Amino acid sequence: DAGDVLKAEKDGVVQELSADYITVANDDGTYITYRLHKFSRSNQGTSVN
Amino acid sequence: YPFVDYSVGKKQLSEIVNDLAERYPKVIVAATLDNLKAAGFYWATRSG
Amino acid sequence: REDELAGLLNHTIPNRDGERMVLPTGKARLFDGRSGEPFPDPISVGYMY
Amino acid sequence: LIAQRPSLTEEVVDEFRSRFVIEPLEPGFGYTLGNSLRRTLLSSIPGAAVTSIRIDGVLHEFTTVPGVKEDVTDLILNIKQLVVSSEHDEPVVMYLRKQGPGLVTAADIAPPAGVEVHNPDLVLATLNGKGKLEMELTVERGRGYVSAVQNKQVGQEIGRIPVDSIYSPVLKVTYKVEATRVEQRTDFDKLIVDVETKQAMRPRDAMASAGKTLVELFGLARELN
Amino acid sequence: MLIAQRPSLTEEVVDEFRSRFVIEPLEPGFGYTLGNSLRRTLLSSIPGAAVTSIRIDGVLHEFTTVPGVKEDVTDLILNIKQLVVSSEHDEPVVMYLRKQGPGLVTAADIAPPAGVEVHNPDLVLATLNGKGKLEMELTVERGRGYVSAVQNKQVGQEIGRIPVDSIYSPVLKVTYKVEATRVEQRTDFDKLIVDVETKQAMRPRDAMASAGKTLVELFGLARELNIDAEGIDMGP
Amino acid sequence: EGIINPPIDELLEATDSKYSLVIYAAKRARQINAYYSQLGEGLLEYVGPLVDTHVHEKPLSIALREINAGLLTSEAI
């Protein structure tokens, strides 16, 4: 509920996967790709990964 | 210093330290405090 | 409840040598890293977060 | 007045775990010997470990390579567990090359003649259908732990990534001093030292190295005349 | 591997029978690795000889008092304990104390047999008053370390044989500590200080040499498993 | 050894109180430092140290050592 965990939008099967992204083939017939934050910077100077 | 021969809580230790400060020079008092600190830590580790 | 913990401390899985290292009182017998002699009395041990 | 002298015998629990029985010692003396041996075994047994890596298309630790499921920083932690053994005094180089989908198991590493990798079932990374891993590893010798800032050379390239080194063939050591009251008309002890190494050498070699290290110090003690 | 900095041992002498040895610069750790072992082997791994039991004439195991002697039985036993002796026969050997008349009875009045010697004849044993008589038998034998009073071996063997504690080890007191020594290069290198206090017979240097020999043999026992094993070589 | 020596009681036995000892030692230390600084010149001014010193020893320590040894005097102007 905090919102820091990536969550799928519609049920499907993971079509392709890599440390930078995840492409999922939705059951309704569409494809959706999620991009992951890698070594960003938060307001306090920590690392978001 | 005369032999103590009785259980030393924190009041007795305060009395002894006050007597040492009252009757002895400062270098001897500092050395005695260091000795007491070292022995206290050593026997507190093995206290159980 | 503490009753359940006290009951469970007697029924863990024994290690490879078939011995439960922590006694039913929750205290374990430790050795001394430097001197090598065992400590006189058992000491509490467990996992903290 | 007691003429019997100590003696040491071995028992094999499994491939890489041994139990050494020393007896009959003087009373109150087993714990000190056991702890001395344990400290020496856990401190000063030489080995080898990877001390640097460089990947084809990487500049630093805080980045990711295409076609792999893991970051470089999360792959350094996987290669820090490699159990390698080397016979060369100078640094040696190994190459890891993998193409196509699957798992980059530690067995895929092709080492030169002289060095060996002893856990060939370790999982380093996972590759998809558009990923190729080409990486170069450096192996040296030593003992203890080196914190990757000692591994930083003067002429470091931008592409060279130093790594923490853990040279320690020993995994877990313990001891038990049975007050067996060995029947000698008096009190005596029986020390039992249990040693488990991490599949790089066998416990007999570790015990021999510990004994060789410990005999020298008491050798310089006895020369006092 | 190579040690890269060879530790050395140095001695200081405080009294005729007190010494302070310093071993430095030891690697990180290695101050407790060979400190407690040194103390233990010095205190309980060196042969010696001592008294085991006495039989004072005219006094049973009751310690009410010794007629004709100012000191009580506990004082007599404690005085006997401080006696330092050397022996050669494995079996226990008995010697006789025959002092008589008013005055001071010391260790110089004993008549040891062949093979046993007393290294402090000037020790005071007791005082005699009122023309009393002191007849004693002292049994001495060899051993290692400190063994408490061996209890009654046979109840009906005799009446007056009082067993006593035996201090066989020449070394009486030992202590040790470790400190940081190195300044130029990276610090935390260990320095070990060992304080030794022995009795009148042996010197601290001989005790240190014997301890070193014993420990070297004990650990060569383990080294023999595989002689061709790489350790920490030292050079010279 | 160090800041602890010489013992404060021995020093106070040679003066009236702490407040005068501070000034006395500080003035002697300034004299010693001034002597050292202008040693390159051939000069007859300031004197000391009056005890055996080290390669580079703080002048205040030397001043306290001389005060304890009893090689100085204090007057009131």
XYZ file of C-alpha atoms in Angstrom:
684
model
C 0.000 0.000 0.000
C 2.962 2.371 0.354
C 3.347 2.208 -3.429
C 7.042 1.258 -3.605
C 6.366 -2.279 -4.916
C 5.678 -2.698 -8.626
C 2.393 -4.543 -9.171
C 0.816 -6.094 -12.247
C -2.247 -4.362 -13.687
C -3.933 -7.243 -15.545
C -3.385 -10.980 -15.326
C -1.043 -12.488 -17.874
C 2.175 -14.408 -18.450
C 5.663 -12.927 -18.198
C 6.821 -12.764 -21.818
C 10.289 -11.250 -21.359
C 12.326 -10.248 -18.335
C 15.525 -8.348 -17.588
C 16.994 -6.311 -14.758
C 15.785 -3.147 -16.526
C 12.242 -4.121 -17.544
C 9.485 -6.736 -17.605
C 7.240 -7.300 -20.641
C 3.989 -9.141 -19.869
C 1.514 -10.425 -22.464
C -1.914 -9.638 -21.034
C -4.702 -12.157 -21.535
C -7.001 -9.620 -23.210
C -4.562 -9.476 -26.152
C -2.244 -6.548 -25.325
C 1.391 -6.334 -24.231
C 2.574 -4.090 -21.389
C 6.158 -3.267 -20.387
C 7.138 -2.056 -16.913
C 10.399 -0.163 -16.373
C 12.342 -0.591 -13.127
C 14.275 2.146 -11.344
C 17.967 1.227 -11.063
C 20.196 3.255 -8.724
C 18.104 6.415 -8.588
C 18.472 8.996 -5.800
C 15.870 9.751 -3.145
C 15.421 13.105 -1.423
C 17.645 12.066 1.502
C 20.546 10.788 -0.624
C 19.938 7.042 -0.312
C 19.586 4.653 -3.273
C 16.296 3.570 -4.855
C 16.794 0.235 -6.610
C 45.164 1.088 53.111
C 43.756 -1.174 55.863
C 42.192 -4.454 54.799
C 38.551 -3.934 53.821
C 36.886 -7.318 54.454
C 33.222 -6.614 53.750
C 30.837 -6.651 50.803
C 31.298 -3.571 48.614
C 28.121 -2.199 47.070
C 28.047 1.361 45.749
C 27.800 3.211 49.071
C 30.870 1.438 50.459
C 32.779 2.176 47.261
C 31.844 5.848 47.563
C 33.103 5.891 51.156
C 36.384 4.247 50.133
C 36.918 6.628 47.214
C 36.197 9.640 49.422
C 38.701 8.399 52.003
C 41.329 7.877 49.296
C 40.777 11.373 47.907
C 40.926 12.835 51.416
C 44.104 11.105 52.618
C 46.259 10.465 49.522
C 47.873 12.430 46.681
C 46.145 12.735 43.334
C 48.403 10.435 41.294
C 47.842 7.517 43.676
C 44.084 8.123 43.650
C 44.019 8.152 39.842
C 46.042 4.932 39.673
C 43.731 3.258 42.190
C 40.678 4.329 40.193
C 42.181 2.829 37.034
C 42.925 -0.423 38.878
C 39.362 -0.601 40.196
C 37.937 0.057 36.726
C 40.007 -2.699 35.114
C 39.228 -5.266 37.813
C 35.542 -4.361 37.771
C 35.225 -4.903 34.032
C 37.232 -8.132 34.137
C 35.136 -9.690 36.904
C 31.854 -8.318 35.541
C 32.359 -10.233 32.299
C 32.658 -13.494 34.283
C 29.986 -12.518 36.824
C 27.249 -14.604 35.210
C 1.653 -16.458 25.153
C 4.760 -17.273 27.177
C 3.385 -20.739 27.948
C 3.571 -21.723 24.279
C 7.168 -20.501 23.980
C 8.206 -22.339 27.143
C 6.601 -25.515 25.826
C 8.170 -25.130 22.386
C 11.709 -24.636 23.698
C 11.719 -28.357 24.580
C 10.629 -29.562 21.110
C 12.908 -27.979 18.516
C 14.834 -29.862 15.816
C 18.175 -31.230 17.103
C 21.254 -30.175 15.159
C 23.581 -32.464 13.197
C 25.038 -33.786 16.471
C 21.586 -34.470 17.939
C 21.785 -31.838 20.684
C 19.610 -28.863 21.604
C 22.027 -26.054 22.423
C 19.534 -23.748 24.194
C 18.186 -25.104 27.471
C 14.457 -24.980 28.338
C 15.215 -21.840 30.384
C 16.221 -20.029 27.183
C 19.898 -19.831 28.192
C 22.820 -21.482 26.405
C 26.332 -22.444 27.491
C 28.915 -20.300 25.690
C 32.696 -20.484 25.464
C 35.237 -17.668 25.670
C 36.718 -16.534 22.377
C 40.035 -15.290 23.781
C 40.728 -17.270 26.960
C 39.036 -20.442 25.709
C 37.607 -21.419 29.090
C 33.808 -21.822 29.215
C 31.871 -19.051 30.882
C 30.769 -19.956 34.424
C 27.003 -19.710 33.827
C 24.668 -20.044 30.830
C 23.843 -16.921 28.827
C 20.756 -15.880 26.872
C 21.050 -16.275 23.097
C 18.771 -15.822 20.124
C 17.987 -13.818 16.996
C 17.148 -10.105 17.001
C 16.026 -7.932 14.091
C 55.693 -38.971 37.764
C 53.376 -39.943 34.891
C 55.409 -41.169 31.919
C 52.628 -41.379 29.320
C 52.904 -38.681 26.652
C 50.122 -37.188 24.502
C 49.129 -38.581 21.126
C 46.864 -37.477 18.278
C 44.564 -39.632 16.137
C 42.095 -38.843 13.355
C 38.499 -39.853 12.651
C 36.638 -39.053 9.426
C 32.996 -38.038 9.826
C 32.439 -37.395 6.113
C 34.412 -36.180 3.099
C 35.151 -32.716 4.519
C 34.752 -33.098 8.287
C 37.235 -34.610 10.727
C 37.575 -35.174 14.461
C 41.053 -35.251 16.012
C 41.477 -36.838 19.447
C 44.458 -35.740 21.555
C 45.110 -37.594 24.798
C 46.138 -37.912 27.589
C 46.682 -34.244 28.487
C 47.329 -32.704 31.887
C 44.231 -31.622 33.847
C 42.834 -28.201 33.043
C 44.948 -28.021 29.882
C 42.657 -29.180 27.062
C 40.666 -25.965 26.698
C 43.731 -23.777 26.130
C 45.175 -26.032 23.420
C 41.781 -26.370 21.763
C 41.243 -22.620 21.658
C 44.775 -21.945 20.409
C 44.266 -24.385 17.538
C 40.817 -22.947 16.802
C 42.124 -19.377 16.642
C 45.034 -20.368 14.403
C 42.747 -22.340 12.079
C 40.223 -19.504 11.839
C 42.966 -16.879 11.324
C 46.095 -17.959 9.451
C 45.395 -20.709 6.895
C 46.417 -19.597 3.370
C 44.201 -19.987 0.337
C 43.149 -18.134 -2.796
C 40.247 -16.016 -4.003
C 39.110 -13.752 -6.822
C 40.486 -10.235 -6.331
C 39.096 -8.369 -9.358
C 36.783 -8.660 -12.353
C 36.129 -6.774 -15.558
C 33.142 -7.168 -17.876
C 33.117 -6.250 -21.550
C 30.591 -3.406 -21.480
C 30.728 -2.166 -17.879
C 32.447 0.849 -16.318
C 31.572 0.576 -12.610
C 29.714 -1.543 -10.068
C 26.516 0.542 -9.999
C 25.146 -0.436 -13.397
C 23.493 -3.335 -15.211
C 24.380 -5.192 -18.407
C 21.786 -5.981 -21.112
C 20.162 -9.391 -21.120
C 20.845 -10.451 -17.515
C 18.466 -10.627 -14.563
C 20.891 -9.128 -12.012
C 22.944 -6.003 -11.415
C 26.728 -5.962 -11.372
C 26.670 -5.269 -7.630
C 24.472 -8.343 -7.097
C 26.820 -10.418 -9.279
C 29.914 -9.395 -7.318
C 28.249 -10.886 -4.236
C 27.672 -14.126 -6.164
C 31.286 -14.419 -7.360
C 32.573 -13.568 -3.870
C 31.513 -17.098 -2.858
C 33.613 -18.871 -5.500
C 35.834 -21.479 -3.833
C 38.966 -21.441 -6.000
C 42.408 -22.927 -5.391
C 45.542 -21.611 -7.105
C 49.157 -22.780 -7.277
C 50.687 -19.685 -8.931
C 52.434 -17.028 -6.858
C 51.580 -14.314 -9.390
C 48.028 -13.261 -10.309
C 46.248 -15.527 -12.790
C 43.352 -14.794 -15.144
C 40.199 -16.767 -15.949
C 37.519 -16.156 -18.577
C 33.749 -16.673 -18.429
C 31.830 -16.639 -21.719
C 28.149 -17.519 -22.067
C 25.591 -16.854 -24.800
C 21.871 -17.470 -25.071
C 19.236 -18.254 -22.458
C 19.966 -20.260 -19.343
C 22.017 -20.217 -16.154
C 25.671 -19.144 -15.956
C 26.775 -21.866 -13.556
C 30.246 -21.676 -12.028
C 31.248 -24.757 -14.044
C 31.126 -22.602 -17.190
C 34.267 -20.791 -16.008
C 37.278 -22.022 -17.986
C 40.363 -21.752 -15.743
C 43.963 -22.039 -16.970
C 46.285 -24.901 -16.028
C 47.237 -24.551 -12.369
C 44.044 -23.229 -10.776
C 40.747 -24.953 -10.051
C 37.171 -24.088 -9.088
C 35.760 -26.494 -6.524
C 32.040 -25.643 -6.343
C 30.871 -26.086 -9.962
C 27.160 -25.877 -9.036
C 27.099 -22.237 -7.902
C 24.612 -20.033 -9.771
C 26.065 -16.680 -10.830
C 23.509 -15.162 -13.218
C 20.565 -15.932 -15.492
C 20.536 -14.928 -19.163
C 17.583 -14.409 -21.495
C 17.565 -14.794 -25.281
C 19.268 -11.453 -26.044
C 22.098 -11.543 -23.517
C 25.761 -12.552 -23.591
C 28.119 -12.492 -20.606
C 31.839 -12.048 -21.315
C 33.804 -11.489 -18.115
C 37.406 -11.754 -16.925
C 38.393 -12.739 -13.375
C 41.688 -12.331 -11.497
C 42.890 -14.805 -8.856
C 45.671 -14.325 -6.296
C 46.886 -15.916 -3.057
C 46.899 -14.859 0.572
C 45.216 -15.404 3.920
C 42.410 -13.685 5.804
C 40.274 -10.867 4.394
C 41.229 -8.017 2.045
C 38.750 -5.183 1.723
C 38.951 -4.290 -2.002
C 40.707 -0.989 -1.292
C 43.949 -2.900 -0.761
C 43.195 -4.551 -4.122
C 43.084 -1.140 -5.855
C 46.234 -0.713 -7.940
C 47.885 2.579 -8.863
C 47.228 2.314 -12.605
C 43.601 1.223 -12.388
C 41.645 1.477 -15.620
C 38.119 2.878 -15.583
C 36.865 -0.615 -16.453
C 38.600 -2.602 -13.692
C 36.376 -3.463 -10.714
C 38.223 -4.512 -7.524
C 36.457 -7.016 -5.281
C 36.657 -8.126 -1.656
C 38.894 -11.164 -1.149
C 38.264 -13.878 1.459
C 41.141 -16.384 1.654
C 39.920 -18.934 4.188
C 39.663 -22.697 3.496
C 38.256 -23.400 6.992
C 34.501 -23.227 7.596
C 33.697 -24.316 11.167
C 35.939 -25.377 14.059
C 34.953 -26.456 17.563
C 36.358 -28.510 20.421
C 35.218 -30.610 23.374
C 37.394 -31.430 26.393
C 36.129 -34.714 27.798
C 37.128 -34.970 31.459
C 37.263 -38.697 30.823
C 39.400 -39.314 33.925
C 41.681 -41.440 31.759
C 42.668 -44.333 33.972
C 46.179 -43.320 35.047
C 45.559 -43.301 38.845
C 44.999 -39.510 38.652
C 42.968 -36.905 36.748
C 43.542 -36.163 33.060
C 41.761 -34.827 29.974
C 40.900 -35.848 26.421
C 40.654 -33.109 23.789
C 38.481 -33.620 20.699
C 38.784 -30.994 17.945
C 36.153 -31.055 15.181
C 37.146 -29.308 11.941
C 35.101 -28.684 8.785
C 36.665 -27.023 5.732
C 34.879 -25.546 2.718
C 35.735 -28.150 0.081
C 39.007 -26.449 -0.902
C 41.369 -28.586 1.182
C 40.966 -31.482 3.555
C 40.969 -31.010 7.347
C 44.277 -32.862 7.755
C 46.058 -30.231 5.660
C 44.436 -27.419 7.649
C 45.524 -28.980 10.946
C 49.052 -29.497 9.616
C 49.270 -25.857 8.527
C 47.967 -24.670 11.902
C 50.538 -26.798 13.710
C 53.330 -25.515 11.479
C 52.301 -21.925 12.190
C 52.054 -22.502 15.946
C 55.330 -24.402 16.367
C 57.414 -21.441 15.143
C 56.308 -18.994 17.851
C 57.028 -21.423 20.663
C 60.262 -22.204 18.836
C 61.372 -18.602 19.232
C 60.135 -18.862 22.821
C 62.310 -21.889 23.640
C 65.525 -20.390 22.226
C 65.767 -18.078 25.260
C 68.313 -20.553 26.701
C 53.358 -17.209 3.182
C 55.897 -14.948 4.903
C 55.574 -13.378 8.344
C 57.028 -10.070 7.014
C 57.917 -8.864 10.552
C 59.706 -11.278 12.878
C 58.623 -11.014 16.541
C 61.298 -10.984 19.226
C 61.362 -11.827 22.934
C 63.125 -9.678 25.540
C 63.612 -10.111 29.288
C 63.695 -7.775 32.275
C 64.702 -8.799 35.805
C 62.964 -7.211 38.793
C 64.101 -9.315 41.756
C 66.295 -12.392 42.090
C 63.229 -14.509 41.233
C 60.888 -12.186 39.315
C 60.998 -11.467 35.592
C 58.998 -9.653 32.925
C 59.183 -10.886 29.329
C 57.963 -8.882 26.334
C 57.238 -10.462 22.940
C 56.645 -8.025 20.094
C 55.540 -7.192 17.455
C 52.979 -9.990 17.131
C 50.533 -10.124 14.223
C 46.941 -8.959 14.790
C 45.552 -11.428 17.232
C 48.196 -13.927 18.331
C 48.410 -12.160 21.695
C 45.739 -14.353 23.241
C 46.609 -17.336 21.037
C 49.895 -17.940 22.889
C 49.303 -15.994 26.106
C 46.942 -18.293 27.973
C 48.803 -21.338 26.653
C 52.069 -19.891 27.974
C 50.499 -19.232 31.373
C 48.962 -22.703 31.618
C 52.106 -24.547 30.536
C 54.272 -22.489 32.900
C 51.954 -23.120 35.840
C 51.140 -26.821 35.393
C 53.505 -28.454 32.850
C 56.902 -28.439 34.575
C 58.127 -31.184 36.952
C 59.030 -30.603 40.570
C 59.206 -32.179 44.010
C 57.352 -31.385 47.219
C 56.136 -32.699 50.566
C 52.991 -34.843 50.540
C 52.314 -35.775 54.176
C 53.742 -35.455 57.681
C 53.548 -37.410 60.941
C 54.125 -35.259 64.021
C 54.839 -37.416 67.059
C 52.346 -37.346 69.920
C 49.558 -35.629 67.945
C 46.647 -37.371 66.223
C 44.655 -35.962 63.302
C 42.986 -33.649 65.830
C 44.447 -30.152 65.397
C 43.627 -28.786 68.852
C 47.257 -27.809 69.529
C 50.812 -29.164 69.513
C 52.077 -29.586 73.108
C 55.407 -27.868 73.676
C 55.158 -25.733 70.511
C 53.913 -22.146 70.459
C 52.337 -22.407 67.004
C 49.229 -24.466 66.290
C 48.942 -27.292 63.768
C 47.635 -25.081 60.958
C 50.650 -22.786 61.295
C 52.962 -25.810 61.266
C 51.361 -27.163 58.088
C 51.522 -23.760 56.395
C 55.194 -23.418 57.354
C 55.929 -26.887 55.970
C 54.163 -25.959 52.732
C 56.538 -23.047 52.063
C 59.501 -25.448 52.104
C 61.170 -25.841 48.699
C 62.836 -29.200 48.062
C 64.416 -31.102 45.184
C 64.375 -34.884 44.805
C 65.463 -37.688 42.480
C 63.667 -40.878 43.610
C 60.304 -41.569 41.983
C 58.946 -43.278 45.090
C 58.207 -41.130 48.161
C 61.148 -40.705 50.533
C 60.980 -39.983 54.268
C 63.277 -37.697 56.270
C 63.358 -36.970 59.992
C 63.179 -33.700 61.933
C 64.779 -34.173 65.355
C 65.126 -30.678 66.847
C 64.736 -30.373 70.610
C 65.012 -27.930 73.485
C 63.891 -24.314 73.786
C 64.671 -22.054 70.861
C 63.933 -21.807 67.140
C 63.434 -24.855 64.906
C 64.280 -24.087 61.270
C 64.723 -26.060 58.058
C 68.505 -26.239 58.551
C 68.042 -28.925 61.237
C 66.549 -31.524 58.874
C 68.585 -34.598 57.878
C 67.662 -35.304 54.241
C 68.871 -38.620 52.784
C 70.845 -38.943 49.567
C 69.209 -37.579 46.428
C 67.020 -34.973 48.173
C 68.086 -31.393 48.892
C 66.606 -28.365 50.665
C 67.213 -25.049 48.905
C 66.421 -22.687 51.825
C 67.811 -23.993 55.132
C 67.138 -20.584 56.722
C 63.351 -21.050 56.605
C 61.641 -20.919 60.001
C 59.484 -23.909 60.945
C 58.431 -23.253 64.556
C 59.461 -22.141 68.045
C 60.096 -24.439 71.013
C 59.540 -23.398 74.627
C 59.645 -25.110 78.001
C 62.138 -27.814 76.975
C 59.634 -29.339 74.577
C 60.378 -31.965 71.947
C 59.606 -31.810 68.222
C 59.768 -35.109 66.319
C 58.511 -35.114 62.735
C 58.628 -37.246 59.597
C 58.393 -35.563 56.189
C 57.546 -37.506 53.027
C 58.583 -35.941 49.709
C 57.842 -37.032 46.146
C 57.732 -35.693 42.594
C 54.879 -34.390 40.487
C 53.533 -31.589 38.321
C 51.386 -28.587 39.141
C 49.304 -28.147 42.281
C 47.397 -31.082 43.791
C 45.155 -30.614 46.817
C 45.448 -32.747 49.949
C 45.189 -36.383 48.886
C 42.486 -37.688 51.198
C 42.786 -40.760 53.416
C 44.250 -43.531 51.263
C 43.693 -46.183 53.955
C 41.737 -45.353 57.106
C 43.414 -48.007 59.261
C 46.959 -47.524 57.956
C 47.999 -45.369 60.931
C 46.786 -42.628 63.277
C 48.953 -39.523 62.968
C 49.728 -39.156 59.259
C 48.393 -35.728 58.262
C 48.225 -35.179 54.481
C 49.006 -31.722 53.120
C 48.609 -29.836 49.866
C 51.549 -30.120 47.474
C 52.932 -27.342 45.270
C 55.189 -29.066 42.745
C 55.577 -26.399 40.063
C 58.648 -24.169 40.552
C 56.640 -21.276 39.100
C 54.380 -19.707 41.737
C 52.677 -16.769 39.992
C 52.160 -15.887 36.326
C 50.188 -13.113 34.638
C 49.939 -11.730 31.123
C 48.458 -8.881 29.121
C 48.459 -7.619 25.538
C 48.639 -4.115 24.084
C 48.894 -2.261 20.780
C 52.444 -1.534 19.654
C 52.815 -0.385 16.049
C 52.814 3.298 15.105
C 54.562 3.767 11.741
C 52.509 1.383 9.596
C 48.941 0.277 10.302
C 48.408 -0.089 14.045
C 46.683 -2.895 16.082
C 49.762 -5.150 16.099
C 49.950 -7.052 19.378
C 52.610 -6.871 22.084
C 52.509 -9.480 24.859
C 53.841 -8.852 28.379
C 54.232 -11.856 30.698
C 55.120 -11.396 34.373
C 56.612 -14.472 36.060
C 57.444 -15.095 39.726
C 59.083 -18.388 40.707
C 60.490 -19.828 43.934
C 64.054 -19.955 45.224
C 65.106 -23.051 43.253
C 64.449 -22.271 39.580
C 65.019 -19.079 37.571
C 62.297 -17.605 35.312
C 64.419 -18.039 32.174
C 64.641 -21.813 32.625
C 60.882 -21.986 33.177
C 60.266 -20.063 29.952
C 62.625 -22.353 28.037
C 60.920 -25.480 29.386
C 57.479 -24.094 28.536
C 58.638 -23.332 25.006
C 60.021 -26.841 24.571
C 56.826 -28.457 25.864
C 54.560 -26.392 23.617
C 56.805 -26.953 20.588
C 56.574 -30.710 21.112
C 52.809 -30.597 21.680
C 52.147 -28.689 18.457
C 54.676 -30.653 16.423
C 52.440 -33.561 17.382
C 49.756 -31.981 15.181
C 52.211 -30.739 12.547
C 53.283 -34.352 11.955
C 49.956 -35.099 10.221
C 51.259 -33.665 6.927
C 54.789 -32.259 7.036
C 54.564 -30.736 3.536
C 51.897 -28.183 4.462
C 52.375 -24.457 3.911
C 52.292 -22.326 7.053
C 53.644 -18.983 8.217
C 57.364 -19.109 7.448
C 59.722 -16.746 9.238
C 63.119 -16.780 7.502
C 66.147 -16.451 9.827
C 54.332 10.005 32.007
C 53.169 12.984 29.958
C 50.671 15.565 31.178
C 50.507 13.674 34.481
C 54.172 14.339 35.369
C 55.491 16.057 37.413
C 52.944 15.485 40.196
C 50.915 18.579 41.015
C 51.438 18.234 44.775
C 55.224 18.426 44.434
C 54.876 21.585 42.338
C 52.423 23.198 44.763
C 54.886 22.536 47.584
C 57.150 25.096 45.857
C 54.548 27.878 45.433
C 51.531 29.412 47.180
C 48.563 28.209 45.106
C 47.620 27.031 41.627
C 46.940 30.561 40.391
C 50.512 31.701 41.037
C 51.997 28.460 39.699
C 50.231 28.986 36.370
C 51.808 32.417 35.881
C 55.209 31.267 37.146
C 55.425 28.295 34.771
C 54.012 30.289 31.848
C 56.566 33.080 32.273
C 59.453 30.617 32.442
C 58.134 28.814 29.352
C 57.966 32.094 27.442
C 61.563 32.821 28.441
C 62.711 29.412 27.181
C 60.819 29.726 23.893
C 62.181 33.230 23.302
C 65.701 31.936 23.928
C 65.197 29.116 21.425
C 63.653 31.277 18.699
C 66.543 33.775 18.557
C 69.307 31.189 19.001
C 70.546 31.690 15.439
C 71.634 35.207 16.346
C 74.648 35.620 18.588
C 72.828 37.091 21.569
C 73.139 37.353 25.355
C 69.526 37.437 26.556
C 67.319 34.865 28.310
C 68.851 31.685 29.745
C 68.164 27.968 29.784
C 67.132 25.283 29.714
C 68.748 24.292 33.024
C 67.932 20.563 32.690
C 68.531 17.824 30.142
C 65.860 17.956 27.429
C 64.774 15.917 24.409
C 65.099 16.579 20.676
C 61.856 18.595 20.509
C 60.268 19.103 23.936
C 57.535 21.598 24.735
C 59.040 24.530 26.691
C 56.235 24.318 29.262
C 57.284 20.803 30.277
C 60.881 21.959 30.735
C 59.699 24.948 32.765
C 57.684 22.687 35.063
C 60.645 20.324 35.452
C 62.962 23.161 36.492
C 60.317 24.528 38.866
C 59.990 21.122 40.524
C 63.766 20.676 40.738
C 64.026 24.034 42.515
C 66.254 25.981 40.117
C 64.124 29.150 39.938
C 62.983 32.014 42.156
C 59.925 34.270 42.201
C 59.858 37.868 43.429
C 57.155 40.541 43.592
C 57.635 43.765 41.635
